[PDB]
């Protein structure tokens, strides 16, 4: 047996496809998938960009969600996201979390022991 | 039998809101209340404090924390940051981070995998 460097595996579609199937076993194919899609992107034509960027957002931030990927995204676009409109962005998220708290948790809280104990505080 | 608080009264009251917080902590969800409090703090703070508090909240709830699917709220605004050139710069930087995760955490186990031995005798 002779041993392949990480770089040679990734820059070779044969080996890279195989590494893909290993990651599929641990339900992680999306990491390789993201890597391939990002490589495809920096050597595509200008015309192809909006579509491939859209396809990648769909595939890797709504249809799948690896945390390492989300971490990097949010780090790099912070200034774009909240440089100015910090208040308006947080306000929009707050409205959505408000609705989840109200519809999904508040009702069960009301029948919780913790809520009954709060109510028999007449001291 | 029992006095029933509206959702609104719970959130606008530190006593009731603390209690609702502990109920959520039980089911490992206290970050939803925590996020609500931090956002309320923000829109009623002093103007000088804002950039720093926005920064600290972004760090706590986008970068470091897991329990809020932030992206549900903001699909358009995130994609607006990915248009044209910014898109390439950002995905390239994400790819570099993923490159390092692949290299450090998975490649080594791949190398000792059955999949790798089968690849070699060809």
Swiss-Prot record, chain A:
Subcellular location: Endosome membrane
Record-annotated RGS domain positions: 5-119
Domain of life: Eukaryota
Function: May be involved in several stages of intracellular trafficking.
Family membership noted in the UniProt record: Belongs to the sorting nexin family.
Protein name: Sorting nexin-25
